[PDB]
Design an enzyme around this catalytic site. Structure first.
Site, mmCIF file in Angstrom:
data_model
loop_
_atom_site.group_PDB
_atom_site.id
_atom_site.type_symbol
_atom_site.label_atom_id
_atom_site.label_comp_id
_atom_site.label_asym_id
_atom_site.label_seq_id
_atom_site.Cartn_x
_atom_site.Cartn_y
_atom_site.Cartn_z
ATOM 1 N N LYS A 1 -4.463 7.480 7.481
ATOM 2 C CA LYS A 1 -4.062 6.332 6.679
ATOM 3 C C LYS A 1 -3.068 5.527 7.497
ATOM 4 O O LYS A 1 -1.912 5.946 7.654
ATOM 5 C CB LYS A 1 -3.454 6.772 5.352
ATOM 6 C CG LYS A 1 -4.504 7.291 4.394
ATOM 7 C CD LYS A 1 -3.873 7.940 3.189
ATOM 8 C CE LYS A 1 -4.962 8.245 2.173
ATOM 9 N NZ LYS A 1 -4.467 9.108 1.071
ATOM 10 N N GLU B 1 -10.837 2.713 -7.189
ATOM 11 C CA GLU B 1 -11.648 2.762 -5.981
ATOM 12 C C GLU B 1 -13.121 2.487 -6.237
ATOM 13 O O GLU B 1 -13.941 2.717 -5.347
ATOM 14 C CB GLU B 1 -11.467 4.105 -5.291
ATOM 15 C CG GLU B 1 -10.016 4.313 -4.925
ATOM 16 C CD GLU B 1 -9.812 5.526 -4.087
ATOM 17 O OE1 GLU B 1 -10.764 6.329 -3.990
ATOM 18 O OE2 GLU B 1 -8.708 5.659 -3.510
#
EC number: 4.2.1.11
Lengths: 450, 447
Positions: free
Chosen positions: A353, A210
């Site tokens: 999500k 990330e």
């Protein structure tokens, strides 16, 4: 018809980790097109099923040719001729056509690719920014003023990190900013100060998935101390300018035999005593409380195990009046589970999500369940992302005021931030970055705000 | 009118390293828009603010302002399809030989955004617009790009002791873009597993490759060959290796020797044995191409060693691609001298080194006329902008250097190449080993 779907097709592309994922292209009769890509996590239990080929001779088992084929041969013929602005009807059609609660037949990665590509095509055909289309056509919100997102991952631990720290994500959050560009200035400067700190400590500054760091640190407090220093070195005040969010990911080290939070990486490395750091639920809550008193921590994600609903409720009672308590794997963006979380007051925030639930329509349902509860909605990336920037427009369209979409490196993260800059510029006075006032689910302590 | 520029503005965005760069948006009278962002690495000047209060001095607000206050008012009303005129006007507006006044990052952002806007208004793919409108090539069939993917890093900005800068795999055995990326993906994952088994760090360098704590270039090459085989492919015939030596970084102009400073400082290399004359450096590179399936060497000698580069090109260049990168800096005037001296047989094309699309195409055509290859290249600081994919396809270079198999500022280009291949169908060809027109590869290597 300006919105009639004329062609629809999927093909295999790559995510930010080099794994296959699904891209879908929708073409309208007007010629306007929409295109979307599906992210992928590092596999939950309650998540909608990400369909992989599992062929060991092709992409180490991670091919998505079956999901792609499901779009091309099963979904596409059913959608040709439909008005692309009929998002809820198109998502309902794919939901019924799969027919399983978790989208195991067609694959959530097939369904979501189409779900998003249809909305993007419609937005293109209406000649409007995606966030305006999602807000005012899909969600019917009749908005002219939009809330920009306070972003929250600069130091990694946990299951996929190379080090001995048990917590998964240590994040910075520039709540003291008054614009998206100033928030990203704060974040960019702090990230680069942190990089200099780590480098001069002799720690590795290569990037995790990330875009943050996974250095060889011994303790969560050592990561948190370094983030406080990076904030100061960049010229900002910890807390009032830049606060901290955690993703504990406690499910990862909850010992189901003993019902204890066992800091297994620190124990195994001989950093931590195994009895001292095998925590009851009560001791784990007390430890998270302590960290929030020692550090400017404003948000805790998955602080307790998804198997520990009673502890989650106690955590939200103890700390949640002034600290954001985020449920991620607790709900898996599932509206049915989020409703149960609302009834039990398990959290005061939900991590959203898209690909955990699998359609845009259901994701909006989960967002609205949280809104009704006065929970915050943190729109979220996955560890495997793409150049697709949908979640930026979604978070702005729903005025969640918060996004979790990565560190200040790697353009599968940066592209969301660049898109938010562009949205802010396009809106001018019609965009508001609320900063500390972005929270409607908690009352931040005045000592922390400044 | 369909192509008239109606509005034009720039604003500050972030590159893949988290540093500011320039974005530009062009809107036409017809309502069509183009948008571009500028990457960041004799180069044209990248203009940075130098304000210690902001971005550790690396803001680009002056460049952004140069677009908004200086360039934008001069381009309103102009025909966006007249790329050559718009680029010439910006060059004169700057008035310096190296774009020092407005900034190459200001000018390139406009140059690219103008072309994308015109392509949008023509309702055509960017690579078709670049090929058939800008370059006037009248193409219906296009060549896809063999990628060279940087999987192991060394040199100036890697935290190891390797002096060479980039170690790359090249899937020349594939017969499609999607098969090429299958080979790349599977090899990259195999390499990751191999590094973990050896206790080496697998988090990513700036270009998505690994920067493990290796002691020798041969160690990196060994691991890459092993990863190729572990992925199920044949080193050479399926996946070859390309190097970016970046020899300018360790060439000692005082002694005229290639001093392997990182390996010497780390007490890995004896300083006498690894302070190489030009002839010993060439002999070393030759030996490397014999021990390893290396098909391409970039900046194998210093930009201050044109005689060396000419000798290297005459010694190995018949069958090994010799790429000039900083030797030319995508500068057409310097590329023409390379042609006349036969310094290389290939040129690395970096749009932001020269600063306009028109001058970049000029550099490409100089190389085409010399029967050189053109390798369209990323910078270490990239964005989600995928212009180089369409440029490499439009110019039919058959080669691209745009990063490893991680980080989507790299992957976005590969995804765009997949989309182009799908769009073109039978009108797209991945040439594999036949992509080279500048060299005749050894049959032993490609069989």
């Amino acid at each position: 018809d300006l919105f009639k779907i004329a062609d629809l097709f999927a093909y295999q592309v790559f995510d930010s980790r080099g794994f296959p994922t699904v891209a879908c292209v929708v073409k309208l009769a007007s010629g306007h097109t929409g295109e979307a890509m599906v992210p992928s996590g590092a596999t939950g239990e309650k998540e909608a099923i990400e369909l992989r080929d599992g062929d060991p001779k092709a992409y180490f088992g991670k091919g998505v040719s079956q999901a792609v084929q499901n779009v091309n041969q099963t979904i596409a013929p059913k959608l040709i001729g439909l008005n692309a602005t009929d998002q809820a009807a198109i998502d309902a059609l794919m939901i019924q056509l799969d027919g399983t609660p978790n989208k195991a037949k067609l694959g959530a990665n097939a369904i979501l690719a189409v779900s998003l590509a249809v909305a993007k095509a419609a937005a293109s055909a209406q000649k409007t920014s995606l966030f305006k289309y999602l807000a005012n056509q899909v969600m019917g919100l009749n908005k002219t003023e939009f809330i920009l997102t306070v972003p929250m991952n600069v130091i990694n631990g946990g299951a996929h990190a190379d080090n001995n720290i048990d917590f998964q994500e240590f994040m910075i959050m520039p709540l003291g900013a008054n614009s998206m560009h100033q928030a990203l200035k704060m974040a960019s400067e702090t990230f680069h100060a942190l990089q200099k700190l780590l480098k001069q400590r002799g720690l590795n500054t290569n990037k995790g998935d990330e875009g943050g760091f996974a250095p060889n640190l011994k303790l969560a407090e050592e990561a948190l101390d370094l983030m406080v220093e990076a904030i100061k070195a960049a010229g900002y005040q910890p807390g009032s300018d830049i606060a901290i969010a955690l993703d504990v990911a406690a499910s990862e080290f909850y010992d189901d035999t003993t019902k204890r939070y066992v800091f297994k990486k620190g124990i195994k490395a001989k950093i931590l005593d195994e009895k001292e750091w095998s925590l009851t639920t009560a001791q784990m809550i007390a430890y998270l409380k302590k960290l929030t008193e020692q550090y400017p921590i404003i948000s805790i994600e998955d602080g307790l195990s998804e198997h520990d609903w009673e502890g989650m409720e106690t955590l939200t009672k103890t700390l949640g009046q002034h600290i954001q308590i985020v449920g991620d794997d607790l709900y898996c963006t599932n509206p049915a589970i989020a409703e149960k979380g609302v009834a039990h007051k398990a959290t005061n925030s939900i991590l959203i999500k898209l690909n955990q639930i699998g359609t845009l329509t259901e994701t909006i349902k989960a967002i609205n369940i949280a809104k009704d509860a006065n929970w915050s909605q943190v729109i979220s990336h996955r560890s495997g992302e793409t150049e697709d920037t949908t979640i930026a427009d979604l978070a702005v369209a729903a005025c969640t005021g918060q996004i979790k979409t990565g560190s200040m490196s790697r353009s599968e993260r940066i592209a969301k931030y660049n898109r938010l800059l562009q949205i802010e510029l396009e809106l001018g006075n019609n965009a508001k970055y609320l900063g500390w006032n972005t929270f409607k689910n908690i009352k931040p302590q005045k000592a922390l705000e400044h």
